């Protein structure tokens, strides 16, 4: 299958997931430094004011987008009882690194500076899955450089490093849906050169992680990325940041996307909801 | 250093913890087959009908009681938005196995039979922490055999078996609050003879786990009980029972008790909150 075909399949497959009713949906364009960034804004059923979650889809920096992540974002919105803003950052190979990073930061800055549009008096948070969790974490680092104060970061099986060494990568790199071959091919599309592996915007593990917002980190037992996820949690804790690190046993990478038929996915969406409700609202 | 003095310290360094407001609170006394069983019923701030959680304090079958678990059970009620019933089972060493099990099943039998007194149309669940988690898992086994149909079980770092062999036991058996010496001493206070190690009511892992209620099982990373908690989960799964097994990283046995100072503890309370709201109300 071609790259385009597979992109199409993502959205096709998503029409099999039930779409939860929410408050209100709005498609906006965000004025970004290098491009115009599409975003969908999900309102909850409760009434403002609100905390705001800026969300970044996974997909290896190659795949995924707003439509195919529409069911997940609805379910997060109902769970978090928060405004959710799903970002369509530019995708490789058409747009190499650090395009998806520029888009993701621009989007956040913008939402942060326009939070009254969404009655977003309760603060901003970032989150994402996989490649998207990478974008969230990097976005939160860049934020510190700009004195943007975020409430929270929700990192769902994030990718946080180039990896040739984790046990989890070797234990789990075949037979569990996301394979080694996939990780390599993703990296080939996304990166310009070998020099990019020195860049904290690709491997956020590289950064000074002090004074980042408190975090929820979800890893998956049978996931090659498991160990690096927990390393990121560990280094955060080391740099004096509060973090709740949580491994869901018995599941594979991506499992949150599959909440309709993997109940542990539903329960993670539940945990994500709770910690955001708690930091925004005190609940 | 004696049993009564040890008990006393628990209750005292637990008196300081600020208590969360709930709806209303009623002490009851259940007609036990062997004793009168005190219990404290916690109502949420929302209004019925309700699901009911029968909860069992930990403390190694030797410590713990209703007063000292009063902060936690309040916290649980608001999270689960569910009628919580704190059960004051007979303690060792004065009352040996299977005393605490008899009480724990008697109390559940009774709450099941008298659910309109609490307005529990949405059914019954069991839960507890540590030895408390044991009590709850055994109770659910005993319920199956008498066709008592439970909605859910919540097992928070459970003790599920006599253990000389797990990695987590050797890796985590010193330095992490709950130690080899303690596991041994508790088991000596609690058990009658070596023949009790054969008894599924001390080691629930022994039992046929078919047709039990779906479970949340929380383990702690630096916890000697971690591996057995996780085995219980996988054994349920092999037996056709849905379960969501979750390892909280960076934390010890007992961490949930410490939710005022340990934020992973609070977040755990929120997950339990969530899974009970889900199965009881659909929320």
From TrEMBL, chains A, B:
<dbReference type="GO" id="GO:0106435">
    <property type="term" value="F:carboxylesterase activity"/>
</dbReference>
<keyword id="KW-0378">Hydrolase</keyword>
<dbReference type="Pfam" id="PF07859">
    <property type="entry name" value="Abhydrolase_3"/>
</dbReference>
<dbReference type="InterPro" id="IPR013094">
    <property type="entry name" value="AB_hydrolase_3"/>
</dbReference>
<dbReference type="InterPro" id="IPR050300">
    <property type="entry name" value="GDXG_lipolytic_enzyme"/>
</dbReference>
<feature type="domain" description="Alpha/beta hydrolase fold-3">
    <location>
        <begin position="53"/>
        <end position="256"/>
    </location>
</feature>
<feature type="disulfide bond">
    <location>
        <begin position="80"/>
        <end position="82"/>
    </location>
</feature>
<protein>
    <submittedName>
        <fullName>Carboxylesterase</fullName>
        <ecNumber>3.1.1.1</ecNumber>
    </submittedName>
</protein>
<dbReference type="GO" id="GO:0042802">
    <property type="term" value="F:identical protein binding"/>
</dbReference>
<dbReference type="InterPro" id="IPR029058">
    <property type="entry name" value="AB_hydrolase_fold"/>
</dbReference>
């Amino acid at each position: 299958a071609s790259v385009e075909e597979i992109r199409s399949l993502f959205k096709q497959f998503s029409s099999l997931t039930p779409r939860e009713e929410v408050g209100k949906i709005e498609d906006i364009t965000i004025p970004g430094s290098e491009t115009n960034i599409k975003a969908r804004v999900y309102y909850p059923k409760t009434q403002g004011p609100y905390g705001v979650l800026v969300y970044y889809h996974g997909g290896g920096f190659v795949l995924g987008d707003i439509e195919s992540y529409d069911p997940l974002c609805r379910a997060i919105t109902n769970s978090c009882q928060c405004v959710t803003i799903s970002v369509d950052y530019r995708l490789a190979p058409e747009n190499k690194f650090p395009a998806a990073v520029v888009d993701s930061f621009d989007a956040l800055k913008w939402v942060y500076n326009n939070s009254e549009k969404f009655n977003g008096k309760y603060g901003i948070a970032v989150g994402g899955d996989s490649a998207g969790g990478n974008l969230a974490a990097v976005t939160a680092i860049l934020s510190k450089k700009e004195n943007i104060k975020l409430k929270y970061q929700v990192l769902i099986y994030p990718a946080v490093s180039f990896d040739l060494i984790t046990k989890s990568l070797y234990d789990n790199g075949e037979g569990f849906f996301l394979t080694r071959e996939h990780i390599d091919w993703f990296g080939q599309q996304y990166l310009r050169s070998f020099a990019d592996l020195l860049d904290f915007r690709f491997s956020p593990i590289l950064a000074d992680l002090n004074d980042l917002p408190p975090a929820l980190i979800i890893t998956a037992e049978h996931d090659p990325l498991r160990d690096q996820g927990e390393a990121y949690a560990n280094k955060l804790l080391q740099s004096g940041v509060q973090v709740t690190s949580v491994e869901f046993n018995n599941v594979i990478h991506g499992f949150v996307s599959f909440f309709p038929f993997i109940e542990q996915g539903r329960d993670a969406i539940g945990l994500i909801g709770y910690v955001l409700r708690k930091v925004f609202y005190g609940k």
